[PDB]
Design a binder for this molecule. Sequence first.
Ligand SMILES: N#Cc1ccc2c(Oc3ccccc3OCCn3ccc(=S)[nH]c3=O)cccc2c1
Ligand SMILES: [Cl-]
Ligand SMILES: [Cl-]
Ligand SMILES: [Cl-]
Lengths: 550, 410
Amino acid sequence: ISPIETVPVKLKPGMDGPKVKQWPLTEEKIKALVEICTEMEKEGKISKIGPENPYNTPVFAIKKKDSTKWRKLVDFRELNKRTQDFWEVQLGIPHPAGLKKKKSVTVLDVGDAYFSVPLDEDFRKYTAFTIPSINNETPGIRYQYNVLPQGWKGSPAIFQSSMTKILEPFAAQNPDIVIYQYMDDLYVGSDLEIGQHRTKIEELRQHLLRWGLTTPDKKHQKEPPFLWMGYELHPDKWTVQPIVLPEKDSWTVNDIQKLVGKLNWASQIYPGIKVRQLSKLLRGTKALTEVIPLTEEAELELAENREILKEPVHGVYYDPSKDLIAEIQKQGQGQWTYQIYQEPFKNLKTGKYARMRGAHTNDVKQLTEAVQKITTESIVIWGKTPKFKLPIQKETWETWWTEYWQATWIPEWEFVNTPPLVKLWYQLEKEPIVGAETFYVDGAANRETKLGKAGYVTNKGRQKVVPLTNTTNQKTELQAIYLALQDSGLEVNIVTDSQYALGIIQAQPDKSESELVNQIIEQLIKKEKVYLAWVPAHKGIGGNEQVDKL
Amino acid sequence: IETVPVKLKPGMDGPKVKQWPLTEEKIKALVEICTEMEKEGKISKIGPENPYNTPVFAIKSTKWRKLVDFRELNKRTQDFWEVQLGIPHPAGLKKKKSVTVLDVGDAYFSVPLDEDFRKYTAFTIPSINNETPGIRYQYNVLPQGWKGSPAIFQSSMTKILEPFKKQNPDIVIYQYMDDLYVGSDLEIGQHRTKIEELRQHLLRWGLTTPDKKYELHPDKWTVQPIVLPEKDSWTVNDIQKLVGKLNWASQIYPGIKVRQLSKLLRGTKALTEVIPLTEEAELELAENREILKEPVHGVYYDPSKDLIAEIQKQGQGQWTYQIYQEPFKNLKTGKYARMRGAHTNDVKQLTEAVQKITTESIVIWGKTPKFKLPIQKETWETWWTEYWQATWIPEWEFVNTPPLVKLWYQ
Ligand SMILES: N#Cc1ccc2c(Oc3ccccc3OCCn3ccc(=S)[nH]c3=O)cccc2c1
Ligand SMILES: [Cl-]
Ligand SMILES: [Cl-]
Ligand SMILES: [Cl-]
């Protein structure tokens, strides 16, 4: 226990304490439970109770390595489901790229952390348990908890608040010592000489011990590199813990998920990791134990990742006196990669952005989206936004954001002439082209038959109708435009009734999940002037009525 | 004095909203502001047995101001400040020639808050890189931005204003959250001197209004009429666009006729061909033009429904908006043109437009609309507080579908 003040705790309103059955157990189990309940009671962490307490909670016994120890287990689910909600404990963890170098770093593990913090007195009656008789002939040993039980909803957050209050006196006396708190650990850094630092560590240990918290001695205190949360914290660098990409003939859905996970994890420091093809295989994974084949693109992507992972890479810690720079590169296939650095040959971290959700996209829009993701991450990790280095010209971006329907925030950025560049591959005409043939296009299909047709009629008397099998009322509308893009000169006016097809093209995409749209894009690049115009269908207006005959 | 008990709607738990990550500059401003507020008793630190949270932000002048987003708590306290302690909305404030808005939020900070209710006002000052769990506070006084704060203070406000209302019985005064809207038909100079009289009256009674060195003229507030293109000469394309917009307008105004216009373009002609209009055709155009000049019929405000504001980007610092409750039943439309400036970030114009629309909606109906914002969610959530100067925050959502009708709402 400890002299810390207890946090007051309530049951969820309208509920009452857990009254749960205690199913019997073996004699060797009931024995090892008493060997611990007497030593727990000796240290005051529990206390025998009478019959007045009407509540109860299941008790179980289990062992590790069949070792001498036979740990007690209490399933506090019924209590936890009836206890008030607490402030949510830490969700995310600090990122190594956001740490600032300290000349010395120490790690201290608190033992019996939850059992070293007292529990609100009025709430102790709801923590009662029972060690049963050998044959339900003897009475049971009623007990109760005095400290934060392991597996109780409020234990993690009450400990953190208790530790934070306990650290307050030492932190005031030692204003230059950094103390990170995380679960049952304390990561203490300082800019003092080793001997001076080691004395302050011993000072912290003694302070923590007077408050009832045990902590390892220098004999048991770890040393760098520290393996924390899948990272490798070295005194002047950080990197991820070694990645193991397994070799298999049959890759199940679960195996692919694990592989995509390790690859995402490695992407924060290893530049160029790609997971598009592997994740595409996951689409519609359904059963986790199903065996799925590998696309040649997927095996190629995995091979490049193995090549990247072959050599080791490390990142640098953060320096607030130096600038924060972000640089982005387009990997292709709708994939982008970025580095965050302050110095040229060392990066704080890396990462990648993929626009999986959008079927149709524009490089400029993707680049803008990737900037947004980097901006949010920079704020989380360093408390500020980076100065961007982007492969786009100002006149290219200014043109796009001027005419884009949505509002865009274009931060400070400088052009980096490192191809692939980001450009506008074509641009529709804002007014009709005089001296250009005017194609009135139309298309349609039957939903049941799936058979459709796409055609056009021009102001010069030209006419075509092409049959289409296994299509949609939407695909034929796109096919009509593609037919008029073909069979037309370098300048063409196209008139459609399909707001769908107008919407897709007016967005000016440069890539899509439809081969047809990719072919239309190819034509639009090859043309000189294209004006796309729209009219209401079935209004019988001009040329559209004649095309509707199709 | 003793505090007014505040009860949440039955079966409604408290707000549990996530704190956004902030710049280091903004975290430090919040730590400074909250350290002062803690010293003045206005807020206190809290432990882990409080699970609720409400986002906090920092806005600006050259002095950092704190802004709590009480949207969720307001929804969960609607009965307390809308039914039990509701503040009625005057319908004559819109009629006034000039309307001035005065910030009176500092009044609430004297009044204590019900002890059993303070836990639901909990907010978190974030740390960087998840170093610290966060500095956690709750209010001991009526907080700004909570809708129950003016509702509780209402009786004190009605008392402080009554001497001024007697002298000036033609001046409309309406309180919405932290602001007073004062409307008069006086000339600008007379109205401005009247506003200073009210400011001095309030200061005499202990109400500091930080107005020491917003004028709105709502007589022009209306649903703007659709304007067909006026052309000396007309092309096939021009007629095509005219017919299309008229067909779209037919959804709103019945009686639109385009059959004669449709006939005027006959055969597979060329878009750049110049088609002179028939005498019959001009008659249809003249009838549709007059039909659109008049206002719609049967468009009334429903106070049981929520107001909806839609905005579309038009280019060259121009934005257009419509306020409605049901489709094609616009209660109000307008066009906000950014005051021509060097700083012109689309976010700045969108943020300024959203504030303008919200203020009008308060003056007209006494409530704010839910915005359909033409911007990416994360971009807005990152940058909206940069130019936010209001004390309230409307509801909003983000539209990912490009309109294709921007020319129509010109
Ligand atoms: N397991 C474990 C573990 C160990 C240390 C952690 C940690 O250390 C610091 C602690 C305090 C200040 C700065 C720190 O880190 C700066 C950067 N740094 C890091 C390591 C070394 S050896 N040297 C150095 O400069 C911060 C956060 C979590 C930690 C978890
Ligand atoms: Cl991604
Ligand atoms: Cl061609
Ligand atoms: Cl709830």
